[PDB]
């Protein structure tokens, strides 16, 4: 069954830390981790507005 | 595996597993440590007494500041069931060997680092912080020719998984490294939560297969603690024995320990660590039933 | 070059809408979309606390 | 493609492309519409005048309420360069045909829906809302035997991509469907932003290849507007001609339109839509240089 995981990352615009909380299978968690090691970056709410 | 479970339990009841551990020599009799013994390399070893044998030390490309290409690290190679296993066992980097460490990671094509320690334990330094902090200086840090960037961290109960990007500053080449840090080892003795250590081994196995699939080969993983022999030996012996049990190879634990000691002195440095390995194997087999 | 994209999804605990803003290549965007169609779900900040 | 660009431009300067469009019959002379013509099926067609030919209508499994398995939808099949292309051209679902629509999606193994319209345009209904709204009722809705759940939406400038999960409520089987909605078509006439329409075609092509790779076969995509002939015909003709140009097949646009009309009456219902297709092809070729 899916479990809860927390992903810590950095906003790609302003160096602020972003806390993402997901529920997923282990395989989908690994796939999501791998996206951060490709090109996927998150924008914090402030930089988004 | 039910026969493997009962066999292991019987051996633990025979009262000789600690007897045979004492008789395993801690290091090779005619061992040669030429490069590690040079006075220029004294400051590059965290524990002066724990150094690699010459024949399987990890040799770096020479530089003007490090002309023998010396790092306190050993190639550990074991063949189990037609499969070659390759580890690099090394000490926790010092402030002035972080660039050596990343140079080793690059030359050896390492995808996975298994760090079986905290940076500081009970006030004493076990490892320099050789990877960046999230959100600090663009989450990046530079060690010699290598720019390292932290992209994510996922905290589990007993360990943390950190994804890193490593850039070679002359070629511009970028690579991925996964940093897996066990966070549950106590300041003295061995962890009481055996299941948590098994979860850490699970994550190492899972990340190794993931990184191998991405490179669609099988580089060594790097394992380090403080001197690279104690907890490092526990991890390596445990993974090798779990694989031996899972594919029913008739290798005895003391025989495997002797082969590891043939390749790096002092691997598993206390009886308590050796007994911990057996409890890891018992728990793995109980998990199977 | 990476572009900015917005992902709208639902919290897996409370039905609130979540707006995620990413920058990524097209391929990593598609891979991220596919994770929502597997098991990956996000938890809103309130349900996270 | 430089010769293809110059050839296309010359033909557009010859003054006959609109002449030949008028002479393309809007529908087959000896066309048969037996099932669509039944009085029980009158209310199932949005535009009474636009119905599928009997030989290639999409036939659903009969039910007690819909015993002829009727939906206003046609199988469109064209072979270009050894490749078979398969579309289902259909009308925008009515409130009482949403369960028919999802039944068609299931039986035909459809992975991609291309919706070339808004739900309401200028006050007039073009399509029922046959997929859920995010955050409304667990982002889910049930249409007959099918429970549909919206998992994400990504808005682009000219179109929106929505990922859906479809569950068959008797078997429990779950499937993925990608819903690609063009949002830039004006209430009357054709879009002025030709590049945006090309971006939409790009997304359809990209999502089709993605879903095909996931099923590691090539089901039809569903294309619909209001009656399933006008904007639907623009999309299908454009994709087929862009592929013809990209792989240098000597098929004339009016010849392709004749073949589409052989399979569904009235495909491309105005000269302005036909001229829009040519401007799409001109822009695609200019993009190449
Ligand atoms: Cl004993
Ligand atoms: Cl004309
Ligand atoms: Zn920011
Ligand atoms: Zn919530």
Numbering used by the authors:
A (entry chain B), C (entry chain B): 55 to 103
B (entry chain A), D (entry chain A): 893 to 1108, 1113 to 1185
Reproduce text from the manuscript describing this model.
Unlike CR1 and CR2, which are known to be unstructured, CR3 forms a homodimeric domain structure whose monomer is composed of two α-helices and two β-strands, in which a zinc ion is coordinated.
The resulting dissociation constant (KD) of the interaction was determined to be 18.2 nM, demonstrating that they interact with each other with remarkably high binding affinity. Next, we attempted the crystallization of the PTPN14 PTP domain in a complex with the HPV18 E7 C-terminal domain, which consequently led to the determination of the complex structure to a resolution of 1.8 Å. The intermolecular interactions between the two proteins are mainly mediated by α1 and β1 from the HPV18 E7 C-terminal domain and β5, β6, β7, and α4 from the PTPN14 PTP domain. In detail, intermolecular hydrophobic interactions involve Phe90 and Leu91 from α1 and Met61 and Leu62 from β1 of HPV18 E7 and Lys1043 and Phe1044 from β5, Gly1055 from β6, Trp1070 from β7, and Leu1026 from the β3–β4 loop of PTPN14. Additionally, Arg84 from α1 of HPV18 E7 constitutes an electrostatic interaction with Glu1095 from α4 of PTPN14. The interaction of HPV18 E7 does not induce a dramatic conformational change of the PTPN14 PTP domain, as its structures in the apo form and in the HPV18 E7–bound form were well matched when superimposed with a root-mean-square deviation (RMSD) value of 0.93 Å over 276 aligned residues. Moreover, the conformation of main and side chains of the phosphate-binding loop containing the catalytic cysteine residue (Cys1121 of PTPN14) and the tryptophan-proline-aspartate (WPD) loop containing the general/acid base aspartate residue (Asp1079 of PTPN14), both of which are critical for the catalytic activity of the PTP protein, are not notably altered upon binding to HPV18 E7.
